[PDB]
Amino acid sequence: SIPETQKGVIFYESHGKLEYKDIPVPKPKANELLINVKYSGVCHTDLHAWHGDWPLPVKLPLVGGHEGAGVVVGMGENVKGWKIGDYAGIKWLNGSCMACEYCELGNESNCPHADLSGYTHDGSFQQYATADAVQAAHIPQGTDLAQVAPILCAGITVYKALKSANLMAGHWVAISGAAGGLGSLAVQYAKAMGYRVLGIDGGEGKEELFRSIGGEVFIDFTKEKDIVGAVLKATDGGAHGVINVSVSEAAIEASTRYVRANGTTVLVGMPAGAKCCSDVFNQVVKSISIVGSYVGNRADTREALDFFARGLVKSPIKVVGLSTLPEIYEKMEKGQIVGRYVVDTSK
Amino acid sequence: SIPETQKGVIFYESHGKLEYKDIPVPKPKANELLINVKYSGVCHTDLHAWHGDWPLPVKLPLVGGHEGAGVVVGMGENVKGWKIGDYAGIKWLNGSCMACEYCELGNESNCPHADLSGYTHDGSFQQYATADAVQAAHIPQGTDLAQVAPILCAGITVYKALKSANLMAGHWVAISGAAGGLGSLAVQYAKAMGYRVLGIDGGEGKEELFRSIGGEVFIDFTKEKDIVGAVLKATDGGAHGVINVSVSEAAIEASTRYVRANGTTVLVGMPAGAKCCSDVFNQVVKSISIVGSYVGNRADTREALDFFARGLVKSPIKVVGLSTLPEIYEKMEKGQIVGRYVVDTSK
Amino acid sequence: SIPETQKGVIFYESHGKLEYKDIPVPKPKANELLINVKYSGVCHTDLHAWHGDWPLPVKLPLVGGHEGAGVVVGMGENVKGWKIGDYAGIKWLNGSCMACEYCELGNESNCPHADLSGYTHDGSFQQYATADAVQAAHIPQGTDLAQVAPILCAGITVYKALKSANLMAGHWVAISGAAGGLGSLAVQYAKAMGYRVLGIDGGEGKEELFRSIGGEVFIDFTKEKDIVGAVLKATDGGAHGVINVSVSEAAIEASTRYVRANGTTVLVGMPAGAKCCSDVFNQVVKSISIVGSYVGNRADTREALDFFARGLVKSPIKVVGLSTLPEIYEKMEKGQIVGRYVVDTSK
Amino acid sequence: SIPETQKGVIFYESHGKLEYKDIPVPKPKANELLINVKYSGVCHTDLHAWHGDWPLPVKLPLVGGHEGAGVVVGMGENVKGWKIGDYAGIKWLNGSCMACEYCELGNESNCPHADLSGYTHDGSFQQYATADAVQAAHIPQGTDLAQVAPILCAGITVYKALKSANLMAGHWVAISGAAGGLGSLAVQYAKAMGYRVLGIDGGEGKEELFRSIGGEVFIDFTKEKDIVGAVLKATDGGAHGVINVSVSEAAIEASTRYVRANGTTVLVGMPAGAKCCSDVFNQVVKSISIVGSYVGNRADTREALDFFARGLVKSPIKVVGLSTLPEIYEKMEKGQIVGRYVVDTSK
Ligand SMILES: NC(=O)c1ccc[n+]([C@@H]2O[C@H](COP(=O)(O)OP(=O)(O)OC[C@H]3O[C@@H](n4c(I)nc5c(N)ncnc54)[C@H](O)[C@@H]3O)[C@@H](O)[C@H]2O)c1
Ligand SMILES: NC(=O)c1ccc[n+]([C@@H]2O[C@H](COP(=O)(O)OP(=O)(O)OC[C@H]3O[C@@H](n4c(I)nc5c(N)ncnc54)[C@H](O)[C@@H]3O)[C@@H](O)[C@H]2O)c1
Ligand SMILES: [Zn+2]
Ligand SMILES: [Zn+2]
Ligand SMILES: [Zn+2]
Ligand SMILES: [Zn+2]
Ligand SMILES: [Zn+2]
Ligand SMILES: [Zn+2]
Ligand SMILES: [Zn+2]
Ligand SMILES: [Zn+2]
């Protein structure tokens, strides 16, 4: 039935050797599911984590990963709306307190008692993982789990960021980083949501990917000397919305400056040490809003998966073995990635 | 009955001598009210107009003023909803194209063809002024035009800001510089809107004043030094809303750090150099929004006036002669202005 | 160059003979466009005007029409944002006071002094008509004025209704009578807005049509009899939004019962007798809203036109001569109107 | 410690004899708290329940009551954020599934698996009761429990109904039934929320109560022949909001007809067999919304109690013995009640 030993990728100090090795299988707590993870998307977040790019410390030794699509093989005595066999999703937000003002308003990700997969809780870069039963993602039977894996962070994230840009069907959204993990999903969520899509990315056939997945206007940051100008021109006065999913502080500076007056620039990506600076005068006069968006809630999860089920968004994924995570991380830190890598935990 | 000559305050160069001289009485176009301004507010926005600072062309020869309280004394053929004897207010936004995206959404401020009182259009620093009938404030019968005049820029601006903060009755709002100028007004609207009010200011008896006008908690920048810590403590986790009257980089920056999760920190004035630098991490992790808020539209205005009608918002004013005006510009170009000054267009 | 005499369609009594006779060309006031209407829509609202049904005074002698597509051929002095040669649209709401609570909130429809095309103001059933410049639609260059004309009442009404339904991309919307008239248009906007579309209609091949225009599920009133049950089943718990084109008491009433919890059921047309009876229990227990939705404001309009610009909303039209008009009123006063009729003001 | 026997009021068939007798103390389930209830507000809902006024059946034999303010003396092994001694509130919504689309959106009351205090779950008309630990109301230590008891249904209910009327500080709200249990709280919530308050009730010193608790304009339905007229007059065109907490189908008819254009009428009260009927034309033309509101959620609970803690709302209560519930019910069915009766479970 349930083994005692499994394989994971784990590091013991920040930015230290990523070890592919045999580790213990974790036991569920009363609130938690034990999931046999079949695939895990790899999120740029997981790299920031390994590098120690963020002001919060990770749990060491840490098993990373937070886009885990697997099966429920065990559960706590306190878990309720779950059967053995159900498919489950391990997300960034392993678990919230579900008892504070924030969790009550559906801003579960902002709970100060938040427990995070691939940071403070052993994640989905292993064959077996634990996750809060209340927060976990109900994945419909029959879902190709390799394909859905990225909806679990990149998908819910950009979906919720779009809602928070307060667009309307027919308005322009500019996706900053349109070819990355988060970017190529945002592009589709946004087409599905009725927006006109402009994409800023750059690199080999990054454009091609963008066209193939429904985007309308592409601006290549490798070639366009005046990004702002192009956006302003392409959208006749600026993006009603901007979704910053680059890992560029620069790209973020620009997003403050090509967003439409009365528009909204959303911050999603979180580059090392990054500040968003904008001129006060300019932001006031133009009544521009700059909004931080942090993953999503359960309702965001249910909605975001519904888009995948209907077939309207689909990550451009390559499936490689878990034991190849050091390679994905090298590829990712060079922005070579066209969409998403998901790891098979069998290899 | 309607004069031909009038007294007013006008210049011929950027930073030219300010001529309290006689000038022609303007004739209203078919779309305008002609207004006999009895009192006008004076703020620093008028200073920057004079100085020729801000980017785009002033209209020389210019009569300044954008806070005009008067009586409709004449009107064009096209005018509707206005009677001779109605009390009218001349705001920053005098008129707009009424035929663009921005205008239609009640964001006329952001019109490409915006006509600006005391800038592109001769303003309230004169006995008789013209104004697009459609934007002009409908001051209610039985409003003291001296006491109401400053409300036409500061009051409405501050009311719009509080809406831009997007709070509900019972949420804490934090107002920087809360006892000086825009602050006092802010505090009073906030209170009248059901918000719990935290004030930050410093100096001779400002705490007393702040209490006397509805302020709940006062944080003293002279005697406290972990502002963030004390705002957090007092509001049990941060301020749902912030209005940033004081515009030091540091005061704004701190807002991003004492603002509650999912809260909104609002940028207000027209400061000609200030930057807002938010840590991307912290802004994303706490789901914070930084909303630039400009001048109110016609609905903002009617609403801001209704609270003042109800006796709920008062400004201490100091009434001196229009003839005295240059003296007051001159005191503003240093900083010898103690308080909120209203000009009497008869003296 | 601009004629003095013109042809138009005018009456002298409530339900009088409809004179296709020559009439003076109206002169625009300083606030108006003079428009050479090339095509006008014809709906039943024009029928009730003629008939003298609705409560308050028609303006005899009257030229009907409220769906006018033309070119700006002249303008008053006050007009802004308009050029000769611009294509313009004459809607139900022609002009308003622009100086009341209602006007300022973009709810001009509800103005006490609302000037209504083909009612209080001679409308689009004529070669040349005048219209308040501020409300007139800005039809984009490169729009076929025949195909666009009906969108000026039905299209916008139907677009506003869907907003009044307050749905998000991926929510089910249920549209009654979905293949006839307002329905087809509704369906197409809904689809273009990201909504999943359920249609209810009945009769000869309406299901086919409905599919051909984006409809997802079709519920056939001929062949099904637990409508509520089938709407519930198909939408897995009810329709987040309902647009009630068909106005039988029963069709509306049912809406309150197939609408999802927290959902919104929208009332649209101008039916001169219909009642909406909701069970208070059921409306309270399912937190249902019943929102009356009227004609779109200037922003509703610019948005509704932009979808049609993009090729996403088409109406089958049938173009017959303005001279032919009374025949069509006459067919409307019974119900011999097969489809959506547009008048050519040259023939 | 915890007795095995206690006293309750219980009936065995609908509208049957209300028995004051010795009953078993209930055992908590894993999810639940066992509360020693000290006081229970009595809600008109509890009467509708005993009479069988509503289309859903009660649990028989039923212990009524759903505004229970007491102490936590025991709890399930699965309960988490609770200590023995905490004060707890039993509300209408004993418990939701907390796992469906609705519960996720914070519309917990609309869960189809909803378990209801004083209908499907033994309520607070007894010394000891069970209640879901996740839904239960955290009452701050030191709260006078007799006074807070009504916040638990009447308070959260009207608070949430006001939010759902979408008013702004300065708009008029008309409370229909301003002197009843729900009414006198709505009046205060609304003053606290910055609205102008108009009240419709009637009966001995019902006005007096209204004045004493902060209401501005009272219209007595015992004396005013034209209620609509008076409201229209009193608020200069109608209530931006209406909160129907009468138990009159009539009063509800009127509320559809004195609500401001663009305003919102909220249905809260649920008289036997009641329909809300409104003219379609009138509701469309005026873009009026009619919205059902069903108690509140946890966040509504936390907010609503915060208003009581700050001292801004206070039920006008008489405290009598539980054993006197047949008398309260007789008084209530004659609309003699000026505010609220709370039952002491010691007598
Ligand atoms: N806030 C959240 O809830 C959240 C959720 C999930 C992920 N994230 C964060 O979003 C960021 C991106 O994660 P990702 O998984 O999409 O990154 P990726 O590496 O897969 O792709 C990023 C894209 O950025 C483009 N990009 C870059 I680097 N610089 C750019 C520039 N200057 N302009 C446009 N595109 C750029 C690259 O080409 C790449 O496609 C990371 O900081 C990650 O922590 C935030
Ligand atoms: N929907 C909900 O979430 C919810 C929550 C709590 C209570 N309720 C419902 O609200 C209704 C009122 O409950 P209550 O506890 O306030 O009722 P009350 O008896 O204490 O006072 C009701 C008032 O109605 C006045 N009233 C009446 I009877 N007819 C009136 C009329 N025609 N005009 C004005 N006031 C009227 C009476 O004078 C009384 O003060 C009941 O149907 C109850 O089920 C609904
Ligand atoms: Zn929490
Ligand atoms: Zn992630
Ligand atoms: Zn000013
Ligand atoms: Zn404009
Ligand atoms: Zn029409
Ligand atoms: Zn008006
Ligand atoms: Zn539920
Ligand atoms: Zn109740």
Q: Does the N-terminal peptide bond of residue A61 adopt cis geometry, omega within 30 degrees of 0?
A: yes
Residue B139 bridge partners (DSSP): B87
Is A201 marked as a binding-site residue?
yes
- Helix or strand or coil: residue D193? helix
Question: Token digits for A4?
Answer: 């005692």
A113 is in an annotated binding site: no
Residues D301 and D289 grouped into a single domain: no
Is A204 annotated as ligand-binding? no
| Residues paired with A292 in a beta bridge | A267
Alpha-carbon span B231 to B223, nearest angstrom? 14
Cβ proximity of C24 and C328 under 8 Å:
no
Domain with B161, as residue range(s), is 153-294
Contacts of residue B299 in chain C, CB cutoff 8 Å?
101, 104-105
Task: Mark yes or no for CB contact A168/C303 under 8 Å.
Answer: yes
Beta-bridged to residue B6, according to DSSP, are B23
CATH number at residue A284: 3.40.50.720
Which strands make up the sheet holding B196-201, listed edge to edge?
Answer: A217-220, A196-201, A172-176, A239-244, A259-267, A289-292, B289-292, B259-267, B239-244, B172-176, B196-201, B217-220
B346's tokens: 């008869």
Q: Are residues A227 and A168 in the same domain?
A: yes
Reported residue count of chain B is 347
User: Same domain, yes or no, for C290 and C301?
Assistant: no
Q: Do D59 and D136 belong together in one domain? A: yes
Contacts of D98 in chain A (CB under 8 A): 134
Does residue C305 contact residue C137 with C-beta atoms inside 8 Å?
yes
C50/C8 Cα distance (integer angstroms): 15
Give CA–CA dist D58/D71, Å, rounded. 26
Tell me, what amino acid is at A312? L
Are D170 and B194 within 8 A, CB to CB?
no
Rounded to whole angstroms, how far apart are CA atoms B207 and B226?
18
- Into how many domains does chain D fold? 2
Strand pairing category for B62-63 and B32-41: unpaired
Task: For chain B, list the strands marked E by DSSP.
Answer: 5-11, 19-24, 32-41, 62-63, 68-75, 87-90, 93-95, 115-116, 128-132, 137-139, 172-176, 196-201, 217-220, 239-244, 259-267, 275-279, 289-292, 318-321, 341-344
Alpha helices for chain C (secondary structure H): 45-51, 101-104, 145-148, 154-164, 182-192, 206-212, 227-234, 249-258, 280-285, 298-309, 325-333
End position of a domain, from candidates D249, D278, D294: D294
Query: Measured between CB atoms, which of A30, A98, A101 is closest to D299?
Result: A101
A143 and A229 share one domain: no
How many other C-beta atoms lie within 10 A of the C-beta of residue D127?
20
> With contact defined as beta carbons under 8 Å apart, do B169 and D159 qualify?
no
Three-state DSSP class for residue B195 = coil
* Residue A105 touches chain B, beta carbons under 8 Å: yes
The reply to whether ligand 2 has any atom less than 6 angstroms from the CB of D128 is no
Q: Is the CB of A247 under 6 A from ligand 1?
A: yes
User: Does the annotation list A180 as a binding residue?
Assistant: yes
Contact list, C194 vs chain A (CB under 8 Å): 169, 192-194
Which has the closest alpha carbon to C123: C309, C305, C345? C345
CA atoms within 13 A on the CB side of D114: 22
Q: How far apart are CA D320 and CA D324, in angstroms?
A: 7
- Pair of tokens at residue B259: 């603002």
Tokens of C215: 């409809």
C-alpha–C-alpha distance, residues A335 and A201, integer Å: 10
Which residues of A91-179 form beta strands (DSSP E)?
A: 93-95, 115-116, 128-132, 137-139, 172-176
For B118: left if phi > 0, alpha if psi spans -120 to 50, otherwise beta; the answer is: left
- Locate A188 and state its tokens: 């589709």
Taking alpha carbons only, the member of D34, D260, D9 closest to residue D130 is D34
Q: Are residues C177 and C283 in the same domain?
A: yes
- Same domain for C5 and C148: yes
Amino acid at A245: V
Q: Write the DSSP symbol of residue C41.
A: E
Give partners of B (≥3 CB pairs < 8 A).
A, C, D
- With contact defined as beta carbons under 8 Å apart, do B270 and A281 qualify? yes
Distance CA B312, CA B309 (A): 8
Question: Is the CB of residue D194 less than 8 Å away from at least one CB of chain B?
Answer: yes
Query: How far apart, in whole angstroms, are the C-alpha atoms of residue D252 and residue D258?
Result: 10
Tokens read off for C24: 């003076």
Structure tokens that stand for C195 in this block: 């909504």
Count the helix, strand and coil residues of chain B and give each as a percent rounded to the nearest 5: 25, 30, 45
Q: C touches which chains (3+ CB pairs under 8 A)?
A: A, B, D
Query: Which of D276, D273, D234, D272 has the alpha carbon at shortest distance from D255?
Result: D276
Q: If residue A245 lies in a helix (H) or strand (E), which one and from where to where?
A: none
Which helix or strand (DSSP H or E) is residue D239 part of? strand D239-244
Residue D44 near ligand 2, beta carbon < 6 Å: yes
Reported resolution, Å: 2.4
Alpha-carbon Rg for chain A, nearest whole angstrom, is: 20
Which backbone phi and psi does D156 adopt, to 5 degrees?
Answer: -60, -40
CB count in 10 Å sphere of residue B216: 18
Do D8 and D125 form a contact (C-beta atoms < 8 A)?
A: yes
- Grouping H, G, I as helix, E, B as strand and the rest as coil, residue D269 is coil
Side chain identity at residue D166, one-letter code:
N
Tokens of D276: 């809300």
Residue at C170: amino acid letter: G
Facing residues of A344 across strands? Answer: A39, A321
Residues 6+ apart with CB under 8 A from B131: B32, B33, B35, B68, B88, B90, B94, B95, B117, B121
Tokens 């299901």, residue located = C207
Q: In terms of domains, do A260 and A190 share one?
A: yes
Q: What is the CATH number of the domain that holds A39?
A: 3.90.180.10
Which technique was the structure solved with, according to the deposited record? Answer: X-ray
User: What is the rounded distance in angstroms from the CA atom of residue D327 to the CA atom of residue D220?
Assistant: 26
Q: Are A290 and A267 in contact (CB under 8 A)?
A: yes
Question: Of the candidates B295, B305, B198, B212, which has an alpha carbon nearest to the alpha carbon of residue B254?
Answer: B198
Distance CA A83, CA A184 (A): 33
CA A323 to centroid of chain Cα atoms: 21
A62 pairs with which residues across the strands? Answer: A11
Residues D210 and D337 in one domain: no
Do the beta carbons of residue C152 and residue C117 sit within 8 Å? no
φ and ψ at D5, to 5 degrees? -130, 145
In B193-324, alpha helices (H): 206-212, 227-234, 249-258, 280-285, 298-309
SS3 D89: strand
B213 and B81 together in one domain: no
Q: Are residues B157 and B269 in the same domain?
A: yes
- Please indicate, yes or no, whether residues D145 and D163 belong to a single structural domain of this protein: no
Chain C residues closer than 8 Å to D274 by CB: 279-281
Helix-helix angle D154-163:D181-193, to 10 degrees: 50
* Torsion over CA: A71, A75, A80, A83 (sign): positive
Return the number of other C-beta atoms located less than 10 Å from residue B306's C-beta: 17
What is the spatial distance between Cα A176 and Cα A192, in angstroms, rounded to a whole number? Answer: 18
Which residue, among D252, D38, D65, D267, has the nearest Cα to D164 in the 3D structure? D267
The reply to whether A106 touches chain D by the CB within 8 Å rule is yes
Q: Considering only CA atoms, which of D181, D182, D60, D65 is closest in space to residue D131? A: D65
Q: CA of C279: how far to CAs of A181, C135, C290, D270, D329, in Å?
A: 49, 39, 12, 9, 25
Per-residue tokens: D173: 């709200």
**Distance set, CA D141 to CA B236, D33, D247, D315 (Å):** 17, 17, 35, 19
Closest CA to C263 of C224, C218, C231, C226: C231
| Amino acid letter for position B203 | G
- How many angstroms separate the alpha carbon of residue B130 from the centre of ligand 6? 19
**Final residue in a domain of this structure, among B294, B314, B335:** B294
Residue to substitute in A43, A163, A226, A256 for testing ligand 1 pocket (most ligand atoms within 8 angstroms of CB): A43
DSSP notation for B286-316: TT-EEEE-----HHHHHHHHHHHHTT-----
Query: Is B306's Cβ below 8 Å from some Cβ in C?
Result: no
Peptide bond into D57 cis (omega under 30): no
Query: How many other C-beta atoms are found inside a 10 Å radius of the C-beta of residue A60?
Result: 11
Is C258 in a helix, a strand, or coil? helix
* CB neighbour list of residue B226: distance below 8 Å, 6 or more residues apart: none
CA distance D145 to A140: 46
**Alpha-carbon distance values, D328 to D108, D319, D320, D338 (Å):** 30, 11, 9, 12
The Cα C126–Cα C8 span in angstroms is: 4
* Residues A18 and A11 sit within 8 Å (Cβ to Cβ): yes
